[PDB]
Amino acid sequence: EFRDCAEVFKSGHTTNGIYTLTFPNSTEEIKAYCDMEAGGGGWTIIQRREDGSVDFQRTWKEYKVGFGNPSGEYWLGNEFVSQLTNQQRYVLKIHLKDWEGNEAYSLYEHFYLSSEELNYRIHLKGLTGTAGKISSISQPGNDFSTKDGDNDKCICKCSQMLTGGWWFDACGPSNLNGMYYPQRQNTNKFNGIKWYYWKGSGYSLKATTMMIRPAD
Ligand SMILES: [Ca+2]
C-alpha cells in the first residue's frame, strides 16, 4: 500500500498512471493519478481540468470524497488531501494552460487543508512561479465552500454565483473549479476557470492541474 504518489515513485514505479493509495489512520483506499514524468515526479494530482466535462457544481459530500475520473477531470477528495497534508509537509504545484498555447505554474513551499471541522481551510506559504507574484488564492486562506456549504467571506454565496466548490473569499482572485468554457468563449466570463494573476480579468483557462508532493 502507498500513502501517495511520492511513496509510489520511490518504490520503483516510475511510470505515469492511476494508482491505488490508502488513507492514513484508516484502511480505506483511493484512486489518484500519479504524474511521475513532470520534473522529478512523485506528483499526486488532486484536481484536473482539460475537459472531459465532469460537472463541478458538486455537493459538500462529493468534494469531500472525490468525483470524476482519475484518467480525466476529477477532484480526488478533501478528506484524503486533508489527512495527507497534515501527516507531513506538502508542496502544492498548480499548472495552467491558456487558449493561446501558453502555460504557467504557481508553486507553494507548503500547503495543507484543515480538518472538515474547520471546513477544510487552505493554508499557503511561500509562493513562486510564472503564474503571478501575488497569490491568486486569497492569502490568510479561506474555508472551503460548496453550493450547499457557504463558508466564504461574502454576504453572498460565492459558490453559486461563480459555480463550483472552492476556497472563496469575497469571491477572491481565483476559481479553478468554475464553469468550463470552450475556445472563443473563454473571455469575458466572471463564471469560468480563473487564476487572476496570470491571464487576468474574465479569462477562463483551457486546462488546469493541482498536484502535491512532499519535500523529497
Ligand atoms: Ca457567504
Domain residue spans in the chain? 1-131+207-216, 132-206
**Is 132-206 in CATH node 3.40.50.300?**
no
Q: Which of 209, 211, 213, 212 is nearest to 103 (CA)?
A: 209
Instruction: Give distance in angstroms: CA of 165 to centre of ligand 1.
Output: 13
Tell me the C-alpha distance between 54 and 40, whole Å. 29
Residue 89 grid coordinates: 509537509
Tell me the C-alpha distance between 195 and 10, whole Å. 32
Helices H / strands E in the chain, number of each: 5, 9
Tell me the C-alpha distance between 180 and 186, whole Å. 8
CA dihedral 175, 183, 57, 92 (to 10 degrees): -40
Q: Which of 113, 109, 163, 106 is nearest to 141 (CA)?
A: 113
Asked whether the beta carbons of 46 and 63 are under 8 A apart, the reply is: no
Instruction: Give distance in angstroms: CA of 88 to centre of ligand 1.
Output: 31
Residue 149 grid coordinates: 456549504
Asked whether the beta carbons of 43 and 35 are under 8 A apart, the reply is: yes
Instruction: Give distance in angstroms: CA of 168 to centre of ligand 1.
Output: 9
The answer on whether 154 is annotated among ligand-binding residues is: yes
The answer on whether 171 is annotated among ligand-binding residues is: no
Tell me the C-alpha distance between 121 and 123, whole Å. 7
Residue 162's identity, in one-letter code, is L
Residue with cell 478528506: 79
The architecture in CATH of the region 1-131+207-216 reads Alpha-Beta Complex (3.90)
Instruction: Give distance in angstroms: CA of 85 to centre of ligand 1.
Output: 26
Instruction: Give distance in angstroms: CA of 155 to centre of ligand 1.
Output: 5
Tell me the C-alpha distance between 82 and 36, whole Å. 22
Q: How many other C-beta atoms lie within 10 A of the C-beta of residue 37?
A: 11
Domains 1-131+207-216 and 132-206 alike in fold: no
Instruction: Give distance in angstroms: CA of 29 to centre of ligand 1.
Output: 34
Instruction: Give distance in angstroms: CA of 163 to centre of ligand 1.
Output: 13
Residue 107 grid coordinates: 508553486
The answer on whether 156 is annotated among ligand-binding residues is: yes
Q: Helical H runs in 2-98?
A: 5-9, 60-65, 78-87
Tell me the C-alpha distance between 203 and 216, whole Å. 34
CA diameter of the chain: 50
**Residue 18: partners with Cβ closer than 8 Å, 6 or more residues away:** 31, 32, 33, 34, 70, 71
Surrounding residues of ion ligand 1, Cβ less than 5 A: 150, 152, 154
**Residue 38: partners with Cβ closer than 8 Å, 6 or more residues away:** 95, 211
DSSP assignment, residue 193? -
CA angle, residues 105, 108, 112, in degrees to nearest 5: 125
Tell me the C-alpha distance between 168 and 119, whole Å. 12
* Structure obtained using: X-ray
Asked whether the beta carbons of 191 and 64 are under 8 A apart, the reply is: no
The answer on whether 152 is annotated among ligand-binding residues is: yes
Instruction: Give distance in angstroms: CA of 121 to centre of ligand 1.
Output: 15
Residue 203's identity, in one-letter code, is Y
DSSP secondary structure letters along 179-191: ----TTS-SS-TT
